[PDB]
What we know:
Layout: E1 28-31, H1 40-46, E2 58-61, H2 68-82
Parallel strand pairs: 1-2
The protein binds one DNA strand through loops.
Subcellular location: Nucleus
Protein name: DNA repair protein
Family: Belongs to the SNF2/RAD54 helicase family.
Amino acid sequence: FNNDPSYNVFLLTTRVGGLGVNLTGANRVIIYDPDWNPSTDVQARERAWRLGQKKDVTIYRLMIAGSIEEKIYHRQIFKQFLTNKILKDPKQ
DNA sequence: GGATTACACCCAAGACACCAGGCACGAGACAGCAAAAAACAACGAAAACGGCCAC
């Protein structure tokens, strides 16, 4: 994927992929389905947002409004707050 | 002294309670064609993917 001008897109199923695979070639990212682990998505974004990435990277989240996606996304935001007030400011 | 005067002794009619057995209740305990056959609803779910080791 990195060393070929063709082979533009490829699906990854971000459970198996994210162990540290180097995919700096990517610049755009599409998230299709929200996951349960709030962590599995940071490695997913890091599949194109490696340290010192060559070009700007963007994330497009898919979210079905008025569905379980709403509950999961709010849950993930709450989980981010959990690790973002325990380690940032316990007054939040 | 001995019999009227009185009082003790007991015994017979009496009663209440006793002893049991009836009598009614009281609720269990039933207990209710056989043979043949067919329809006929209900008895009734661990997802899915990865990182492996051993093929």
